[PDB]
Design a protein around this motif. Structure first.
Motif, mmCIF file in Angstrom:
data_model
loop_
_atom_site.group_PDB
_atom_site.id
_atom_site.type_symbol
_atom_site.label_atom_id
_atom_site.label_comp_id
_atom_site.label_asym_id
_atom_site.label_seq_id
_atom_site.Cartn_x
_atom_site.Cartn_y
_atom_site.Cartn_z
ATOM 1 N N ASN A 130 8.715 -9.053 8.449
ATOM 2 C CA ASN A 130 7.407 -8.827 9.044
ATOM 3 C C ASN A 130 6.682 -7.746 8.256
ATOM 4 O O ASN A 130 7.274 -6.721 7.906
ATOM 5 C CB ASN A 130 7.521 -8.419 10.518
ATOM 6 N N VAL A 131 5.401 -7.980 7.983
ATOM 7 C CA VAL A 131 4.564 -7.052 7.232
ATOM 8 C C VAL A 131 3.375 -6.669 8.100
ATOM 9 O O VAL A 131 2.708 -7.542 8.667
ATOM 10 C CB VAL A 131 4.094 -7.661 5.897
ATOM 11 N N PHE A 132 3.113 -5.370 8.201
ATOM 12 C CA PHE A 132 2.012 -4.847 8.994
ATOM 13 C C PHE A 132 0.795 -4.600 8.112
ATOM 14 O O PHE A 132 0.917 -4.299 6.923
ATOM 15 C CB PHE A 132 2.421 -3.555 9.705
ATOM 16 N N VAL A 133 -0.382 -4.731 8.709
ATOM 17 C CA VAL A 133 -1.642 -4.635 7.976
ATOM 18 C C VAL A 133 -2.494 -3.566 8.646
ATOM 19 O O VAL A 133 -2.323 -3.269 9.841
ATOM 20 C CB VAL A 133 -2.376 -5.994 7.914
ATOM 21 N N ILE A 155 4.162 -1.512 5.746
ATOM 22 C CA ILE A 155 5.492 -1.372 6.326
ATOM 23 C C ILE A 155 6.112 -2.756 6.444
ATOM 24 O O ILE A 155 5.559 -3.636 7.116
ATOM 25 C CB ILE A 155 5.447 -0.674 7.694
ATOM 26 N N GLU A 183 9.636 -4.555 7.682
ATOM 27 C CA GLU A 183 10.786 -4.266 8.527
ATOM 28 C C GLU A 183 11.731 -5.457 8.550
ATOM 29 O O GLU A 183 11.302 -6.592 8.785
ATOM 30 C CB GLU A 183 10.347 -3.918 9.952
ATOM 31 N N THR A 220 15.194 -6.604 10.551
ATOM 32 C CA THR A 220 15.984 -6.276 11.727
ATOM 33 C C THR A 220 16.983 -7.388 12.012
ATOM 34 O O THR A 220 16.835 -8.521 11.544
ATOM 35 C CB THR A 220 15.097 -6.050 12.963
ATOM 36 N N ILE A 228 13.283 0.158 6.994
ATOM 37 C CA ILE A 228 11.833 0.178 6.865
ATOM 38 C C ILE A 228 11.468 0.654 5.467
ATOM 39 O O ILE A 228 12.125 1.542 4.911
ATOM 40 C CB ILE A 228 11.176 1.072 7.939
ATOM 41 N N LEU A 258 -8.607 -9.227 -1.528
ATOM 42 C CA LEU A 258 -7.813 -10.454 -1.446
ATOM 43 C C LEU A 258 -6.602 -10.418 -2.373
ATOM 44 O O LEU A 258 -6.146 -11.457 -2.856
ATOM 45 C CB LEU A 258 -8.664 -11.698 -1.730
ATOM 46 N N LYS A 268 7.389 -13.267 2.074
ATOM 47 C CA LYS A 268 6.341 -13.400 3.077
ATOM 48 C C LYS A 268 5.020 -12.940 2.482
ATOM 49 O O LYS A 268 4.934 -11.837 1.932
ATOM 50 C CB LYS A 268 6.670 -12.587 4.335
ATOM 51 N N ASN A 269 3.997 -13.782 2.594
ATOM 52 C CA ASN A 269 2.668 -13.486 2.076
ATOM 53 C C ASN A 269 1.735 -13.159 3.232
ATOM 54 O O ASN A 269 1.671 -13.905 4.215
ATOM 55 C CB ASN A 269 2.119 -14.665 1.269
ATOM 56 N N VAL A 270 1.015 -12.042 3.112
ATOM 57 C CA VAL A 270 0.084 -11.592 4.137
ATOM 58 C C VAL A 270 -1.249 -11.261 3.481
ATOM 59 O O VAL A 270 -1.335 -11.013 2.277
ATOM 60 C CB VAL A 270 0.615 -10.369 4.919
#
Lengths: 97, 109, 107
Positions: A7-10, A21, A23, A25, A61, A74, A90-92
């Motif tokens: 998971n990637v936070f924006v 970040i 994570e 788990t 983390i 972008l 994972k692409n975000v």
């Protein structure tokens, strides 16, 4: 042997530089490697990995330093997780940008 | 006249924010030199930015495709502006004519 | 037993494709304070003016010349609540000073 979740936070849509970040788990064993990618290119500096902590499960983390302008241009950021010979990508991207 | 064959793309009515950079990309995607002399905001609460680049005289006459990309926070998709000299047009000699004022205008003094 | 600085409040939110798992999907929110002194700090979560008393976990404060500290907190959220344009606020209390940060999915 359980595959770690990626998971990637924006940054917030309405504004905040910032940090990324990633994570992982519910993975086993404790050792794990986490890296960062920028538009498909290897990142050589500007990233740090925090020590793995215990949540038996473990939590790791990572922090990547990014600039405000580049994030909304972008640019493609991918978190790479290697565990038990498996690689997860994972692409975000920004929702508003 | 001045040997200043530079091309710029101007953005108006956008929000007065910072961290804006204008990069010029050719048809092959190669990058060019950066620019300086960043302007400031206007009293009308409208930001102003200019992207300067240096090109050669022969390159412009060769019909190369140049694209200016805008990197703004409000716009989710960077717009593309194409600037190129239209080839295949003929050249004509301009004719300069001077029209003196008529006698009906020189009455109110 | 040198300086005191006001804490900085930063809120992290998931992207549009940051929700996974069986329906309803869930995600996490991260509120972190860095370069703050003294060490003690209070972290609370607010959802549309309602205090959140469950589903949150705050990591112990760890050390990152004035001494510096960092704190990491995680709150579990639901996809349905996020889609309802709910506003999440991280409450920071430091030496009697309150700092609030408001985030939302609206652009």
């Amino acid at each position: 042997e359980m595959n770690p979740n990626v998971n990637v936070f924006v940054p917030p849509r309405d504004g905040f530089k910032s940090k990324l970040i990633c994570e992982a788990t519910n993975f086993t064993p404790k050792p794990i490697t986490v890296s960062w990618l920028k538009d498909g290119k290897l990142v050589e500096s500007g990233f740090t990995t925090d020590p793995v902590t215990i949540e038996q499960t473990y939590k790791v983390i990572s922090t990547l330093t990014i600039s405000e302008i580049d994030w909304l241009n972008l640019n493609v950021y991918t978190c790479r997780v290697d565990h038990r010979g498996l690689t997860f990508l994972k692409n975000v991207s920004s929702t508003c940008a | 006249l001045t040997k200043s064959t530079k091309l710029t793309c101007l953005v108006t009515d956008l929000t007065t924010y910072d961290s804006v950079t204008i990069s010029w990309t050719r048809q092959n995607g190669e990058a060019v030199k950066t620019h300086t002399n960043i302007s400031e905001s206007h009293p009308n609460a409208t930001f102003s930015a200019v992207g300067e680049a240096s090109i050669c005289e022969d390159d412009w006459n060769s019909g190369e495709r140049f694209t200016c990309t805008v990197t703004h926070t409000d716009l989710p998709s960077p717009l593309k502006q194409t600037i190129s000299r239209p080839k295949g047009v003929a050249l004509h000699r301009p004719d300069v004519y001077l029209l003196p004022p008529a006698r009906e205008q020189l009455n109110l003094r």
